[PDB]
Ligand binder design. Sequence first.
Ligand SMILES: O=C(O)c1cccnc1
Ligand SMILES: [Zn+2]
Length: 222
Amino acid sequence: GMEINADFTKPVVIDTDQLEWRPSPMKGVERRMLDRIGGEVARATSIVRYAPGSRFSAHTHDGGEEFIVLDGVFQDEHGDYPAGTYVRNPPTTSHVPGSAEGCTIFVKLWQFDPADRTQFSKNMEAELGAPVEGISTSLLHEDERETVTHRKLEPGANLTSEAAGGIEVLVLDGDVTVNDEVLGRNAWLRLPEGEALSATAGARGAKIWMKTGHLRFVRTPE
Ligand SMILES: O=C(O)c1cccnc1
Ligand SMILES: [Zn+2]
């Protein structure tokens, strides 16, 4: 089937601003696929853009749905999710999505444990703690499998992680140097199990989203 960066032993870095927007099944929703594994129904990581005035029929999240609103405002029957909002919609949940204004989101599908029932949304900046050596951290989500954070890095600040079970990063603002490479806004990085992350912010600092541990639990939708 469609297997995009489906060898989780390989590091990948992507300047996602260079990728073609491709059609999705939803009218007015286009996608930049980042990783994908499985047949008909997919464990998927994508950036997707909803056109202004997007209104759809309901859907259910058979494998869960996690996302960051990158720009604009996403909506459902429970209200607004403005840019900077992080959302977990666990397996078996449902809603009617839309976007009056349009939005762009970073979204993961079918990467929840089937038994997970934790659902919420969070302003990623609102619970940033005190800086520790120029890094402020907001704990977005943590369970026995994964740890999800938002990090704000002052200029020159270094985040070094030796977290187990894989490391995945999306650059939200500014830039970080990783392995001699400058990663700006919308760069996506996935590092295989055992590889340390060392990211140093540039002159304007940086903001990132980060998940660790999840590559131990890669599953094709059953
Ligand atoms: O990953 C995808 O293909 C995707 C995710 C959300 C909405 N449309 C497509
Ligand atoms: Zn949904």
